[PDB]
């Protein structure tokens, strides 16, 4: 995904555990977040985006 | 996966969100363990048989 403006990124509607997934990759160079598919989740997070 | 803590005889094997390796599976090998602690949240996702 490319964006048009260049400023501050913030994280809205973002919580760990329930939406997104931080995973450590056993190589040192990745260390990324995953964002969890919106089937296998809970009941509570349905409408959280 | 291990979405919850192996826990046996006060020693930590696997956390919380980690991937089982052969390395892990090796260390269960050589521990001789046949009892950890499992949590309510994975009894519901069993099939029971009779």
Same mark, same amino acid.
């Given at each position: ?8 990124? =913030?994280? $809205? %509607?973002?919580?760990? #555990?329930?939406?997104?997934? =931080?995973? $450590? %990759?056993?190589?040192? #160079? ?6 969890? %598919? ?12 | ?50």
């Amino acid at each position: 995904v490319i964006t048009e403006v260049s400023g501050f990124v =913030r994280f $809205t %509607d973002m919580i760990d #555990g329930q939406t997104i997934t =931080r995973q $450590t %990759d056993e190589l040192t #160079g990745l260390s990324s977040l995953v964002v969890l %598919d919106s089937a296998e989740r809970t009941a509570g997070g349905k409408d959280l985006r | 996966t291990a979405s919850f803590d192996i826990e046996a005889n006060g020693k930590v094997y696997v956390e919380k969100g980690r991937r089982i390796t052969a390395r892990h599976i090796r260390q269960l090998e050589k521990d001789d363990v046949k009892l950890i602690e499992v949590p309510v949240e994975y009894i519901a996702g069993k099939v029971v048989a009779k």
